[PDB]
Amino acid sequence: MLGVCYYPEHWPKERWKEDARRMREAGLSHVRIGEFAWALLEPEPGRLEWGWLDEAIATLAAEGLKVVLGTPTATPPKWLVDRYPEILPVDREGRRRRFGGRRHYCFSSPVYREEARRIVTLLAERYGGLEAVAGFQTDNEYGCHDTVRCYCPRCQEAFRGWLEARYGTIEALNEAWGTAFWSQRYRSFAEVELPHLTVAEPNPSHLLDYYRFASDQVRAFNRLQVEILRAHAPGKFVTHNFMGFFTDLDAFALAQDLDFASWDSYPLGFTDLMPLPPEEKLRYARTGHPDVAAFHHDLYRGVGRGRFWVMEQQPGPVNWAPHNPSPAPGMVRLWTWEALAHGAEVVSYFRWRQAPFAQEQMHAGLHRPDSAPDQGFFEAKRVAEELAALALPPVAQAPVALVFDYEAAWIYEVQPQGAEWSYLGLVYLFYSALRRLGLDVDVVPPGASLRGYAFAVVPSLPIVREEALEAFREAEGPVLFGPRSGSKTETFQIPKELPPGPLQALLPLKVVRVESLPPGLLEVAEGALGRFPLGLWREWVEAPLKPLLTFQDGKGALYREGRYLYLAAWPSPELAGRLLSALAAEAGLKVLSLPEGLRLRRRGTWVFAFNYGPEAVEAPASEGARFLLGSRRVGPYDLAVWEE
Amino acid sequence: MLGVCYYPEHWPKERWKEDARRMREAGLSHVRIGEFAWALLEPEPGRLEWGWLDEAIATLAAEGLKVVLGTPTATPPKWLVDRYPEILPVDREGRRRRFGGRRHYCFSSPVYREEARRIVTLLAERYGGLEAVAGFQTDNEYGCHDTVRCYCPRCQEAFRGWLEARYGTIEALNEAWGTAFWSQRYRSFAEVELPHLTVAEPNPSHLLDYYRFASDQVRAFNRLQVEILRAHAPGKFVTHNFMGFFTDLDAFALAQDLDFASWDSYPLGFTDLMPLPPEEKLRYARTGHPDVAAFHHDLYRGVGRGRFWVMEQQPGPVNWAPHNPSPAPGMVRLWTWEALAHGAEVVSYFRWRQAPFAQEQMHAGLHRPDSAPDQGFFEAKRVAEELAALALPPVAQAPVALVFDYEAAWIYEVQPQGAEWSYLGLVYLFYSALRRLGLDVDVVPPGASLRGYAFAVVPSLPIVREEALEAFREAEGPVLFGPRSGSKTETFQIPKELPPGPLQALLPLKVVRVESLPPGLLEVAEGALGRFPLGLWREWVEAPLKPLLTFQDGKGALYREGRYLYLAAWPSPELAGRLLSALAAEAGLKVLSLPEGLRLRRRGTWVFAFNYGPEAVEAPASEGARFLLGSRRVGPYDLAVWEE
Amino acid sequence: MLGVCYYPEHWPKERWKEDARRMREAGLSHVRIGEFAWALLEPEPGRLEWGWLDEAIATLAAEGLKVVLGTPTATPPKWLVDRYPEILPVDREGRRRRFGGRRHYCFSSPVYREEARRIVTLLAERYGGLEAVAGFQTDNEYGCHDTVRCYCPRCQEAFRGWLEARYGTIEALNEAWGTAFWSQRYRSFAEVELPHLTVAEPNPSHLLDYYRFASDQVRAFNRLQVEILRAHAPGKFVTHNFMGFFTDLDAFALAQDLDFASWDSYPLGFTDLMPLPPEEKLRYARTGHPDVAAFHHDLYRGVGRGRFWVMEQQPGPVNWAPHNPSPAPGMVRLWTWEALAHGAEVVSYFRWRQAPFAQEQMHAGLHRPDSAPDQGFFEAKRVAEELAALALPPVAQAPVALVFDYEAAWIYEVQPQGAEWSYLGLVYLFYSALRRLGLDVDVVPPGASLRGYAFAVVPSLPIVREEALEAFREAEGPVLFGPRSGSKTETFQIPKELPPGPLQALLPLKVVRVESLPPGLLEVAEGALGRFPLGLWREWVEAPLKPLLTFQDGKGALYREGRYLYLAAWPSPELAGRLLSALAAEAGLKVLSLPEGLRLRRRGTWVFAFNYGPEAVEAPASEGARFLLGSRRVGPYDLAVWEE
Ligand SMILES: [Cl-]
Ligand SMILES: [Cl-]
Ligand SMILES: [Cl-]
Ligand SMILES: [Zn+2]
Ligand SMILES: [Zn+2]
Ligand SMILES: [Zn+2]
């Protein structure tokens, strides 16, 4: 099913009936509207104007389209901000932000909680029972523009409440944070302030708790809306649109309150911002890195407990990256089929028609400002026609699981210890290694059962709780733990047993020292797997175990005991691929050495091949395979689907 | 005529008579004084001390020198700032600036408007009728140190007044800005705030109007002083000293209130700050890039409706750039003759003697702190001697016009869409291309008649108003429009007809998509003109016209219909030169392939050749030409003048 | 003697007796404690809890260990900061800092002066007479985290008092600063504000006086504590722990109030932050640059009038640099012996045991968090065993003196004039040149007698006072003055005679112009010494003297008259080495061309050779020399000591 993000409030009413008709003719089934309409619904305080929205919904419904209503809390009206200045957030520099863009609100503001409650309840009671409305999207991209973390007075007071609920007594907090250090000791929760503008660095336990708190406030703000929708819009789904490479908000946790997860994919924008090698930045400028959308489809399929949508799909050039190229011919179709291959229930394009005014006037849509269909329209229509004849098999469990953790992202953000240490970079490195072997991946959270997986990869899990340890113990296949795993306690302290902490119940080894190294300083770690120059991060392991890979000084780089492996250094792409390939072979899994721009994803017994270019490549299909779409020779920016 | 910037208030009175005598002996005719003397004229509130200034003026006049008085508003006294804290400006970060340097005032402050009125009226009534006074310079470099744009309370309230005057009703503003977007809708002008510290980016229409407003406030502040000088100093000229590569202030607009334009040239400082290729940065470190002063002489000759002065000319190393080399031997003389060749009525050196104290103690003068003549003195004296025997022919209209627009600079500053898009960079690229062909250039504003020009180049003109379109329609020669021309309406919206908007009445083509590309991503555009690898910016053109240059995907890069051409991509220096050369040939204009460091400028039937080094070159003079200065063999940092 | 920094307040009391025993067994003699214990000594306002500290001291004393007590003013308790918000400092951006880290106090706060007085007096009266207490360390690293300079209201008012004391009258200040410039004239000291947030740059005289003031406030704050310790802890030494590459605080001046100087050495951290060439950054990542610790030992031996301690010595990886490698095997021992060779009376390791909580949990100690001895422990124990059998000869005067000045650092910080001009960089360049010649160095302040030195090097001394000139006149050997020496008067003005100002009484030459050049712009200066491509900084010298080195344009780069030499350009390492070698030969001093990683330091008739690696090298020992430690073949990260 395909959909689109539409803004009836940006166009003359006379255009609505035409737009709705064309959406149906294009083969679309869902249309999202309303997330930025508060100022149009309540232009004057207390005076609601539902007329135009009632009409827009009716117009779309008349064409048989299903409506997805976004609650309008991402952009409060100026009259509301003027009435309650406390709604405006404060940045890390201590400056109050201003109206003019979007997301200008604090998640801790009690006033905004009530205003959100009011408008969402009104929206839910009015449209919650309409057959035309399929569900809702709460707010819009919580946290975008660095808005999860606010440092205003409301947040400072709420943080104290959060801390008291978490620790019970200030004594427990002092012990947890180790406040004897630098005389940080607090006499009460009232003495604790937000961790910013400190002289020297803030306490890591202090900063991590603040990040946990900030994420929790977003979840609380969201929960309020979910409860309203459950009570006044029974039977209608509730989702939220998450972002690419964004970790300030714990999506796994927030999604527990949603029916499914949704996310917004803009491959070209993410890619331009990625620190790719010189050659790749040019090669993938108009296609996106081969794993950028896929990683997130897998992540969000996991965040949604198996169910997810791509609420926003890039259909042409965007406006927000340093460089905004046009997707190459066929890439919109490719990204769409890729989303579907990874399990997306719906792929919705942002947006129907390019706006000729305001901030995003340079953001392309399926149609140009003059309403003429743009390149993305034809590609989307083609997919609609192809999908109509290609009902898809169900998504099966992947052979490999990758354990992702938002808390881990926070810990490494707080304590990198090495300037080049990157949590997302480490996760992506392992992900790409698996993808280049032609393996499908399921991204799961700590504690999720690993039953059924050939093997699992844990890029890094600093805090290992009982639930996670339990899942690892019950794993039927090997589990590879990346560097710094089990290196921190729940309170951001070094475990008494030293890293890898709880994991020592599985692996008899201890990390007695760690090193972060300047770029360029490499040392070969060698063994049966091969020779690998490694750098960036290195750990000294004390263990009776014979390392599988050894550095030139005799120190081990990789260890294994039973089904558990531990990597004591930052992996190179080469090491990641060879190690993962060896684990695959051991597990009886077949692998393929896919060329740089080719990627595969299965759906039942079907296999999808996506070629990110720039030249044609052959799909590694079995002999006699039956092609459902495309051919064995896959042209650039094209794809093939076959019965394997 | 040569002049100098002098500060009698920095030296013992006993030195004044000597300085005046030496200025006359050097061959100088004009002396500028007083722009930073408020604290010396009014050391105590309400207590004026004209004594020393009366004497300084009398001393200079006794030597037959003409005095140019600068109004002292660039640097208000500390007692005044202490009395009225509102005078101090507020930066984009929301911080109030402080006294200690210069230009610490807000252009919107009603209090400062009155204080400026008071001191300027006093100055005008006292010296406005003196024969020794030739004219005035208002303030000093409006906008320097990022002072055009202030974000204080006074500016926020004045902006609202400006908006109401511009739009009439808030309804008109909401439509112009497209405030339905992100619920930005305003109920009144009172709800509109300045466009800074917003979450996400501010509305482009909002930011552009703020930039227009800021520039307008400077013009208003200046107009007040001009009116005072017209009323109390009748017959005395009024000018202002503009800066290099500065666009925050619309000089074309402000100069409408001046008798002529003046500007301050510091080639080495501008050059060190320019992103020149590795080789050029070293080659021109002590000479300045060959086109840096020339571009501004042409620009300001246009800003001044044909009349301009170089109020400040670099005579040695300066203090403000990251690197401050000494001008190579002969460069002060070269820059001076170049200014004169481009039409400068007067070239005034900053400054007479290097100050031994304060912020600019490392800024050289014609004399060292110990009063001994410095290298610049001898070079200036030589020019005085040479000019005395070389009365100059009148400046003639150039063969090529380059249309420059300050509003365009603001639009691209607001919406670059590509990190490397640079308005000044694009303008300079075209300018240098013309200069390397040996062609003289007239820089003109939109709407200025193009009658008489062989052809015209419009680097980029986003908003094309009726007056500009009229001028293009009446052009007698071809007009080349650069990328993004006609891409915006007066309210910063995409034209209904799409870019190039109004220009579609001249060229039957539409820009349906634009791309900004990462550095290094190049694609060849080829045709009769040649093969050109292009990047940075690319536009997709929909048109029945056969492109003159085509990319590898078949998309056109250059189009033409009648006398109008449209470039749909960022030009390379190579493309700019070949295209401009072809236009010159078509127009019957002779061109020359000048070597890297040689430049030409005509004055009547005379031709000036300037060699920026590092080695000697031959002047492309006709056979039998009569040399007025120098010889056919032009040494580095030297020049030649001949009757062509 | 070896010591350690210990934090009994971070560990269970049951561990104290064990720690003390192990410190004795390791061979340690001194233990520093208490500098961050205020919150533990006074958890509740007015309620002191000395119990635990009394016990910790008694426990250490029982093992025969000497205690060094740090006054606890570096980290005031939260209840105190809450009571007096004025204690918190304000940054250059005008923002009030917050509690959470350390050093969150203003040196001008009258309230904090009294609170410091109170707690230090209590500490001194209670422990000042104990036999177990050897001395005190005042506060902890004054200025760390950019805390010397504060811009709060208290500092603005104190600065005015400082100015009135310095100038007497505002008239004198106006003349000294040259306030006629840009109308900066002040009517009274009350009109003077701090030099920050100005529009354009602040007056250099103004900024320099502020920096002098800031340093003076630290000295005043410290003096208060010294007086208390002299009165209540008679016979106990008082020192302070200075930092590497830190110049905001004039250590020479502050140390006048101390019994000896101490400093904190972290070679790997300093080195990672240094702009070393690509190759060296990798080669010395785990060793530190060969001259980084040595330069500071020599500097602080001078700051301490011949006496100094290394209060904190890196024993493993740290937590605060972008990259934190582990010291290579043997480097802790090497750094320790190097400190001793340079005269350190005591080398104290930071810290005894790695903390498992808070900000520095990744900072290694002699023991891991689980109390197991770490690599540094064994290396420290080895040195203790070796030193026990190697009583050291006395430190003798070095053959070469290097004149260092904190005021010079401030002047160049205020007025770099060239982006690459670096005072510490220039000093280090000369230092390394001397070190690579195998010469020992004494770092002395301006005014210190140069009697006995073969020759002296003055990297740069902008202000040359009578005392300094006197010392130069009485020098028995040549004195080399670096560029910009004598270029400023005490009030930051250009001398009437022009640079080198007072030095013209020694050298008949004048600097008539200076140039700062872009990186890469080089020009050869040649003569008998050789050919040297030079850049960065170049001065034009007017003199009757024949230069020893001449540039391609005939301008001199190096001059000499009698025993005084003047370098008119930024030196290359090659020039520094050849010039210094020539001076050594002339003085009858033998030199050696030491390979990159080898360094020598004498102690009496003994010579120490330190090999920073990565490969073995031979110690340049005389034939038949008797080795006290090691052998002629010095392995990497190892050393040798012999009777030369
Ligand atoms: Cl739309
Ligand atoms: Cl002057
Ligand atoms: Cl400890
Ligand atoms: Zn908040
Ligand atoms: Zn203002
Ligand atoms: Zn302060």
Short mmCIF file of N, CA and C and ligand atoms in Angstrom, two decimals, chain B residues 5-8 10-11 351-354, ligand 2:
data_model
loop_
_atom_site.label_atom_id
_atom_site.label_comp_id
_atom_site.label_asym_id
_atom_site.label_seq_id
_atom_site.Cartn_x
_atom_site.Cartn_y
_atom_site.Cartn_z
N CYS B 5 44.15 60.10 5.01
CA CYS B 5 43.32 60.07 6.21
C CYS B 5 44.28 60.46 7.33
N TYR B 6 43.92 61.49 8.08
CA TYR B 6 44.78 62.03 9.13
C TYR B 6 44.08 62.14 10.48
N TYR B 7 44.84 61.95 11.55
CA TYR B 7 44.28 62.02 12.89
C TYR B 7 45.07 62.97 13.78
N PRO B 8 44.80 64.27 13.64
CA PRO B 8 45.52 65.25 14.45
C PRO B 8 45.37 64.99 15.95
N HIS B 10 45.65 62.36 17.47
CA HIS B 10 46.53 61.27 17.91
C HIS B 10 47.96 61.75 18.10
N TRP B 11 48.22 63.00 17.71
CA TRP B 11 49.56 63.55 17.78
C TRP B 11 49.66 64.88 18.51
N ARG B 351 46.93 55.32 6.47
CA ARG B 351 46.74 56.66 7.01
C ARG B 351 48.07 57.42 6.91
N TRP B 352 48.07 58.69 7.31
CA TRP B 352 49.29 59.49 7.24
C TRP B 352 50.46 58.91 8.03
N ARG B 353 50.23 58.60 9.30
CA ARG B 353 51.28 58.04 10.14
C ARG B 353 50.76 56.89 10.99
N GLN B 354 51.53 55.81 11.03
CA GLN B 354 51.18 54.63 11.82
C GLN B 354 51.05 54.99 13.29
CL CL D 2 47.65 60.03 11.10
#
